[PDB]
Amino acid sequence: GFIGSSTNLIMVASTTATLAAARFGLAPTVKKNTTAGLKLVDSKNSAGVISNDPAGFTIVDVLAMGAAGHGLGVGIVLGLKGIGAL
Amino acid sequence: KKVKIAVDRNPVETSFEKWAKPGHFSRTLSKGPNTTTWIWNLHADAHDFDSHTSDLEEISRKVFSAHFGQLGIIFIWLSGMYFHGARFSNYEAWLSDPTHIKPSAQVVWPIVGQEILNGDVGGGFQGIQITSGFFQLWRASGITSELQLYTTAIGGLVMAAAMFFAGWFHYHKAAPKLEWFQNVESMLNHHLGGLLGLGSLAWAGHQIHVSLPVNKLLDAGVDPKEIPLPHDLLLNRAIMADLYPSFAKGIAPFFTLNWSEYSDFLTFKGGLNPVTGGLWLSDTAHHHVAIAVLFLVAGHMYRTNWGIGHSM
Amino acid sequence: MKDFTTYLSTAPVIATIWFTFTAGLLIEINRYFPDPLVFSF
Amino acid sequence: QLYVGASQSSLAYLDGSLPGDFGFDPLGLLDPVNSGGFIEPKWLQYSEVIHARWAMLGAAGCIAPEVLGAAGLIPDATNIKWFESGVIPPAGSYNGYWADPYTIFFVEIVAMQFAELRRLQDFRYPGSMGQQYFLGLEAIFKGSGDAAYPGGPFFNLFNLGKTEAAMKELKLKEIKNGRLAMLAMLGYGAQAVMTGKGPFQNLVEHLADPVNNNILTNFA
Amino acid sequence: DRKLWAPGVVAPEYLKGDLAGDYGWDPLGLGADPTALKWYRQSELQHARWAMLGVAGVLVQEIVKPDVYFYEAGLPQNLPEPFTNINMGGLLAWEFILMHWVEVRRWQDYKNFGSVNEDPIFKGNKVPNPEMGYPGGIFDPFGFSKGNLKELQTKEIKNGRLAMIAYMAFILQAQATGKGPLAALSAHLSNPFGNNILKNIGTCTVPHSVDVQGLTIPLTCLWPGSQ
Amino acid sequence: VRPVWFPGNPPPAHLDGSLAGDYGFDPLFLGQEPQTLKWYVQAELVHGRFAMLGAAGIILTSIGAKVGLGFPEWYDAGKVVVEKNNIDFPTLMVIQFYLMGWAETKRWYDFKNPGSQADGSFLGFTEEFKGLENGYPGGRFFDPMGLSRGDAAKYQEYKQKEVKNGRLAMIACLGFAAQYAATGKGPLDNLADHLADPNHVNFATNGVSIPIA
Ligand code: CLA
Ligand code: CLA
Numbered sequence A: 001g002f003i004g005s006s007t008n009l010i011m012v013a014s015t016t017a018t019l020a021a022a023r024f025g026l027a028p029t030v031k032k033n034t035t036a037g038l039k040l041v042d043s044k045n046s047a048g049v050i051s052n053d054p055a056g057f058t059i060v061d062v063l064a065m066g067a068a069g070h071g072l073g074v075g076i077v078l079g080l081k082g083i084g085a086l
Numbered sequence B: 001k002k003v004k005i006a007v008d009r010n011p012v013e014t015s016f017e018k019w020a021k022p023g024h025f026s027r028t029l030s031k032g033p034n035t036t037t038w039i040w041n042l043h044a045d046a047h048d049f050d051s052h053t054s055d056l057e058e059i060s061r062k063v064f065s066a067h068f069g070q071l072g073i074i075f076i077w078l079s080g081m082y083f084h085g086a087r088f089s090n091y092e093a094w095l096s097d098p099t100h101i102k103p104s105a106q107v108v109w110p111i112v113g114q115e116i117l118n119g120d121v122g123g124g125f126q127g128i129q130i131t132s133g134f135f136q137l138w139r140a141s142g143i144t145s146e147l148q149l150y151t152t153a154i155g156g157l158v159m160a161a162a163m164f165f166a167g168w169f170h171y172h173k174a175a176p177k178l179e180w181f182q183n184v185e186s187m188l189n190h191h192l193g194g195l196l197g198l199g200s201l202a203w204a205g206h207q208i209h210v211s212l213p214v215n216k217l218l219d220a221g222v223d224p225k226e227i228p229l230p231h232d233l234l235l236n237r238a239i240m241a242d243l244y245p246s247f248a249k250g251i252a253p254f255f256t257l258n259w260s261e262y263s264d265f266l267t268f269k270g271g272l273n274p275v276t277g278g279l280w281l282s283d284t285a286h287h288h289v290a291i292a293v294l295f296l297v298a299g300h301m302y303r304t305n306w307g308i309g310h311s312m
Numbered sequence C: 001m002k003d004f005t006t007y008l009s010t011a012p013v014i015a016t017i018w019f020t021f022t023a024g025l026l027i028e029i030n031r032y033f034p035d036p037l038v039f040s041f
Numbered sequence D: 001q002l003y004v005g006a007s008q009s010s011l012a013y014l015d016g017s018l019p020g021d022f023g024f025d026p027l028g029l030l031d032p033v034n035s036g037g038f039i040e041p042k043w044l045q046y047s048e049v050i051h052a053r054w055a056m057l058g059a060a061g062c063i064a065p066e067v068l069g070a071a072g073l074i075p076d077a078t079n080i081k082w083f084e085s086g087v088i089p090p091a092g093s094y095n096g097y098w099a100d101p102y103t104i105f106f107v108e109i110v111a112m113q114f115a116e117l118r119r120l121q122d123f124r125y126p127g128s129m130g131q132q133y134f135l136g137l138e139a140i141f142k143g144s145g146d147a148a149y150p151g152g153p154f155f156n157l158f159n160l161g162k163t164e165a166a167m168k169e170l171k172l173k174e175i176k177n178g179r180l181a182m183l184a185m186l187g188y189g190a191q192a193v194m195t196g197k198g199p200f201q202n203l204v205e206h207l208a209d210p211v212n213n214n215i216l217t218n219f220a
Numbered sequence E: 001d002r003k004l005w006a007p008g009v010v011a012p013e014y015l016k017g018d019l020a021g022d023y024g025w026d027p028l029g030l031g032a033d034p035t036a037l038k039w040y041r042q043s044e045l046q047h048a049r050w051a052m053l054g055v056a057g058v059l060v061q062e063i064v065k066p067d068v069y070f071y072e073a074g075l076p077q078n079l080p081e082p083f084t085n086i087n088m089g090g091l092l093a094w095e096f097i098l099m100h101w102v103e104v105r106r107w108q109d110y111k112n113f114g115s116v117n118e119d120p121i122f123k124g125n126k127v128p129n130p131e132m133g134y135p136g137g138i139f140d141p142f143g144f145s146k147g148n149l150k151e152l153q154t155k156e157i158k159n160g161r162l163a164m165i166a167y168m169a170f171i172l173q174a175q176a177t178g179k180g181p182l183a184a185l186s187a188h189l190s191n192p193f194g195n196n197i198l199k200n201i202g203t204c205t206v207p208h209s210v211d212v213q214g215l216t217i218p219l220t221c222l223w224p225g226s227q
Numbered sequence F: 001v002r003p004v005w006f007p008g009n010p011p012p013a014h015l016d017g018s019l020a021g022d023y024g025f026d027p028l029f030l031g032q033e034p035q036t037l038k039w040y041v042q043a044e045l046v047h048g049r050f051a052m053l054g055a056a057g058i059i060l061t062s063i064g065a066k067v068g069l070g071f072p073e074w075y076d077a078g079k080v081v082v083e084k085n086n087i088d089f090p091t092l093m094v095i096q097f098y099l100m101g102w103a104e105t106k107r108w109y110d111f112k113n114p115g116s117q118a119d120g121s122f123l124g125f126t127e128e129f130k131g132l133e134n135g136y137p138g139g140r141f142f143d144p145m146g147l148s149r150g151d152a153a154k155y156q157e158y159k160q161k162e163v164k165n166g167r168l169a170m171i172a173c174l175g176f177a178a179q180y181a182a183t184g185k186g187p188l189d190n191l192a193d194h195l196a197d198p199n200h201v202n203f204a205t206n207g208v209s210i211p212i213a
């Protein structure tokens, strides 16, 4: 089956990886941008958007990190397919 | 919120009162002509909007609606070319024999001897051999009928009227403020995702579903009258899965990232089609899919209302 | 529509109308009387 | 706020006074300041209610023939899928109407032209439609202050919602069912394009095999 | 106007119980101007009384001769024995004249209340008028009036509304099933679970036309389905 | 406060409730100027009167051609008339041009100068050509029954009825033209085709009116 294959594992791993990287202060999020030197500094947030998450994780945060992790997983699976590893 | 819609309701009244007064846009020419140089200055300063006034908001509104008028005119011109390819062309004759018949879409009236300009182009036709390449573009789109050109012309006229209505609206009824035009982050994000990203994606969809099968059958010697219509290639997946067996798999290979299954209509052939002398439409389809993805990820770069992104 | 008809009274619109009319008159003359080189009639 | 997705910018002008205000305005289209045209709050609320009512008419009208032929109250001739009813002749067309769909379409044109233009002229001039003669019917077309809820003798036929609190309760219920039905109509169209079957067929096939008849298996 | 048509509603400003059988319904607001209310009350009375006569005729004709379909009883080949295959044109002429007279007189009663109350040939005997639409006199010969007039008016108009509903029910049952009212009742009591409005809607037993002495009357139904 | 073509929309300022058939219908503001509006009033009235005559004539000749009497249809009656009778079409056309030119030039120069045409210049006729209003000449000749005289309210009612039946007849003549362009047969031919099967026989089932299907 697909659910449980290498592609699905890699994709969920990449998506949850970016999500847990943004949630636990290891990746740039809505509330924390970066400078030229990649140091996490806060943001204006340009609207203000609420969230019940203790850290402040938002629906925008999950959309952004889902898109990034989906790009990462797509690229990884099609690369491993490209070098014959998959 | 910072990046938002910000307009003024009914800034400029819609009346021909300023049509009857030439030179109204400037302080010097509104007094009237005394010399003929006024007549030339009236035209040289007509679109010099940044000298009619100092406020960038009114200049910007003028520019926006003027762009809308230019778009409406371009749509008129495009609809006219499609219409001339529908009524006054040898297109349906050219599709059957494009190597022999000369593309013509402009017929001349026989008034003062200029019927000699209605040359023997081919396909039992007499007209001016056009060099704009609309016939090749239409074959590459998968037209194969003058009725589709006719309705494309009518759609172009509809869109032209829409653009002119839009210019009138965005000047006289609801004109945006300066802080709307000044959201260049949003303008770039949108013109990259939706305009050039989603535009290339939609054109890729057309190239997948209409151009590729129609042109594949055209290159296989099939007569343009017996080719399935594009909507029949949309609904009946059997035809496409006969032409490209990866359509039997559906859109699953996309969502399962088994994209190589799509290698029947998304190719990297390169070179030219030996039978038409043009690029492979599968190559162009994959091209537009790719640059659509590229532009859609490029349109998520700048920061508009949610802190992610860049400040230019 | 006094201002609209004032606009149509402007120099370029009146010139367009008048030269359209003149050119159409000459064109229809040259249709119904083709190739008028001399005054024979 | 509620309705995760709400923003601090939206809660400045979203004060809960509108029916269905759950703070969800992430794009900020209901901002009264510097708003004109059709992105004014009044027109957007009006169009929410109209899309809502039309969509919860359609969500019942797309599912009703299928569940009434499956129940056996209507015959199998009219037990058809909603997209194969003549709305999209490519997809299908029932031929057993009293006329061709274009005759009936012109009847629809005239009828809805009358109706929707009177509706519009009451949105624009709210006191109107109770003044010009319409065969005596103008007595029920005076409307109300707001446009989405006229509430005349006919549009509020049973005069339900006597009090203000019950009226706001009913407006909330109406708009909630309407949003739910809008999403259901979007899903009807989506399942028509992908599955090609009716919505009730999709439902019974999901309840027959939940893990093998779903969105993911319908990709092939 | 007491005990309205629905609990949670209010009566209109123009219906206060001044007329008989007023439950304050008027959801379409048609009786807003009083002249239209007069006209609609007169037409109500006419529709009501003609529908009472209609259901009476159908039911009585069906009980005393069930072998005659009331839907096809207007045809001259189904007319009774002295009038069988009579010339329908002269019959229509008789009806046209005799009803144009009385209905123009009634219309003039509407337009000028208390002007056509007099017999225009024998110039001594008039008909009184308590209200408009209730002449009395020779039209009320048994003398049931000069009593509870509003009560009898409510009874008349309520039985009349009911008769309107019931006659359109007769017509629809005749178009759907092809039988008379009591025929339909006996047929429903013959099979109350397979012979009802279910599986009868969608069938119209009415033909697309008839030939009554040379003409071609279009002969429609009230709804489509099966010619 | 007054019936308007598009209810709710208030009437424009130049269309007060003074002219017959005034419903505020000037979305293009064509009759904004009063003199132009007078010209257009007379134009509407002449168009509507000519169209009332034309619609009545078409209807009558189609009635006679439907019941089987020897009538040509309106799209064939000119040929039939000039060919059955030995009528020269240019001669008849310029006779009509002479007569209508006299009449319409009289009417024109009574529009430009209303008091004129009544100086006894024509043949001594003064009060037959004086003109009552713009578009309503009246007099012993154009009004022998005197219906503009006597009752004024009846005259306003007749003005409303005239302009309304005139707009209806103009629409009817445009419909005659469109129906000949579409169905190719006579107006009452189309009417009988509709009365036979109202469904399935209408403009939606031409093939030319709705080109989609
Ligand atoms: C300036 C030099 C010149 C001269 C003298 C001519 C002369 C002529 N050209 Mg050439 N031509 C020229 C330049 C010139 N052309 C140029 C520069 C071009 C390139 C654009 C051409 C291209 C060209 C073509 C392509 C053709 C001509 C033709 C002609 C002939 C036209 C005769 C005609 O129209 O009858 C018109 C006769 C009249 C009597 C009209 C006179 C004007 C008015 C209307 C008279 C008034 C009557 C009345 C009172 C009006 C009523 C009032 C109204 C408001 C109701 C004539 C020999 C045609 C031809 O056959 O040539 C032999 C032809 O086909 N020319
Ligand atoms: C924008 C570009 C575009 C578009 C529009 C389409 C469109 C389509 N593709 Mg193509 N495709 C594209 C790009 C595109 N494609 C590209 C780039 C690729 C390469 C990866 C493919 C590869 C591809 C394959 C391999 C196949 C398709 C197929 C299809 C069809 C099935 C759609 C489907 O299952 O998705 C699901 C989509 C939806 C569920 C959305 C439906 C939304 C509806 C319309 C909502 C509206 C309802 C409304 C709210 C209420 C009703 C209104 C009224 C009636 C009351 C459809 C015609 C399939 C097909 O049919 O083949 C011919 C197929 O096998 N596509």
Ligand code: CLA
Pocket (backbone or CB within 6 Å): B005, B007, B162, B163, B165, B166, B169, B170, B174, B175, B176, D035, D036, D037, D038, D039, D040
């Ligand atoms: C350069 C193009 C352009 C731009 C930048 C704008 C920008 C704007 N317009 Mg204008 N407008 C345009 C073209 C444009 N318009 C045209 C062409 C028309 C004629 C139809 C109008 C008619 C118009 C009106 C009537 C109104 C605006 C309004 C607005 C404002 C908000 C729009 C918004 O948020 O809606 C976002 C979009 C939507 C909510 C729904 C859009 C749905 C349409 C039908 C789809 C658009 C085409 C699509 C991208 C491509 C087709 C894909 C499809 C086949 C799948 C904003 C200032 C509004 C405003 O505030 O007044 C200033 C307003 O009332 N515009």
Ligand SMILES: CC(/C=C/C=C(C)/C=C/[C@@]12O[C@]1(C)C[C@@H](O)CC2(C)C)=C\C=C\C=C(C)\C=C\C=C(C)\C=C\[C@@]12O[C@]1(C)C[C@@H](O)CC2(C)C
Pocket (backbone or CB within 6 Å): F025, F026, F027, F028, F029, F030, F047, F048, F050, F051, F053, F054, F055, F057, F058, F073, F074, F075, F076, F077, F078, F170, F171, F173, F174
């Ligand atoms: C449809 C028509 C005019 C329609 C005008 C409209 C909608 C105007 C609309 C607007 O301007 C306003 C009001 C206000 C503006 O702000 C907006 C617009 C929208 C611009 C005129 C028809 C006008 C029609 C006329 C005058 C018809 C006359 C017919 C005659 C004489 C027929 C004669 C014959 O048919 C017979 C009798 C027998 C045959 O054998 C011989 C012949 C000759 C064929």
Ligand SMILES: CC1=C(/C=C/C(C)=C/C=C/C(C)=C/C=C/C=C(C)/C=C/C=C(C)/C=C/C2=C(C)CCCC2(C)C)C(C)(C)CCC1
Pocket (backbone or CB within 6 Å): A015, A062, A063, A064, A065, A066, A067, A068, A070, A071, A072, A074, B293, B297
């Ligand atoms: C509730 C909660 C939870 C959970 C949650 C979750 C689980 C979530 C998830 C989330 C997710 C899971 C998300 C996802 C997302 C995704 C996305 C967002 C996607 C996207 C996509 C895209 C964007 C694409 C793109 C593209 C394409 C289409 C093609 C190719 C190219 C690219 C890649 C670019 C917790 C912890 C428990 C607890 C508390 C709270």
Ligand SMILES: CCCCCCCCCCCCO[C@H]1O[C@H](CO)[C@@H](O[C@H]2O[C@H](CO)[C@@H](O)[C@H](O)[C@H]2O)[C@H](O)[C@H]1O
Pocket (backbone or CB within 6 Å): B234, B235, B236, B237, B238, D192, D193, D194, D195, D196, D197
């Ligand atoms: C703006 C929306 C963009 C997103 C893309 C969706 C655009 C919709 C365009 C119209 C598509 C109509 O056609 C669509 O319905 C057909 C009939 O159900 C489907 O047809 C397909 O599915 C059905 C059941 O599996 C069967 O008819 C066939 O096996 C197969 O051809 C196709 O999936 C698709 O061709």
